[PDB]
């Protein structure tokens, strides 16, 4: 690593400056996770309800796929454990919701 | 506010512990934003391509809606400006991708 890179920085934690999961053709459920050693302590993970997507009749169409849309987000991990004022920056891969995609199928 | 709440905490910045935008029935484009006063400095915003969703024929179906899936994410804002080691925690509302939803339409 670079010795000029600050191994510790100061952070001021005072931040100042209907639902699609059901109506989507690729609907999802939400799973809660709580960890008091993490800040934010509560995060939610979307889980696609079905393998296929919902058609105009309200049935699952397996010729299309529900897939989760994911991104990495930043959180703070208490370090040492239980510390009220000392953390390490951490990244987590979270599923935010689902979308409906045309599958990869070859006409061979 | 609570006077026992730490107004400054230490953070160690050393983190250690095909594509759907095109194939989706609610496809999206990605817009880049760069701000050197923010860490991460580069974020991307999904913009839904269409008002409707793409049908089996490859055409836009306006009886369904493409909508963006959004979440707030945490970033660090340099404070004072240009500081290499002093920040304020900040939250940003980002669009991660789009999904296809049944519209709100009343049969009145």
């Amino acid at each position: 690593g670079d010795k000029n890179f600050p191994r510790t920085v100061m952070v001021n934690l005072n931040i100042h400056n209907s639902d699609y999961y059901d109506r989507s053709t690729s609907p999802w459920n939400l799973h809660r996770n709580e960890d008091p050693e993490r800040y934010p302590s509560v995060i939610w993970e979307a889980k696609c309800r079905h393998l296929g997507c919902i058609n105009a009749d309200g049935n699952v169409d397996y010729h299309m796929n529900s897939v989760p849309i994911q991104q990495e987000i930043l959180v703070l991990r208490r370090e040492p454990p239980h510390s009220p004022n000392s953390f390490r920056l951490e990244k987590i891969l979270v599923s935010v919701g689902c979308t409906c995609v045309t599958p990869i199928v070859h006409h061979v | 506010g609570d006077k026992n709440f730490p107004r400054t905490v230490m953070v160690n910045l050393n983190i250690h512990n095909s594509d759907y935008y095109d194939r989706s029935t609610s496809p999206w484009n990605l817009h880049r934003n760069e701000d050197p006063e923010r860490y991460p400095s580069v974020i991307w915003e999904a913009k839904c391509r269409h008002l409707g969703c793409i049908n089996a024929d490859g055409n836009v179906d306006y009886h369904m809606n493409s909508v963006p899936i959004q979440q707030e994410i945490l970033v660090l804002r340099r404070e004072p400006p240009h500081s290499p080691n002093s920040f304020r925690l900040e939250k940003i509302l980002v669009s991660v991708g789009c999904t296809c939803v049944t519209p709100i339409v009343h049969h009145v």
Partner: peptide
């Protein structure tokens, strides 16, 4: 803001 949490809609809240 002793407790920071996401709600099920992707918004952050001080609890």
């Amino acid at each position: 803001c002793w407790v920071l949490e996401y709600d099920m809609f992707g918004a952050l809240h001080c609890r």
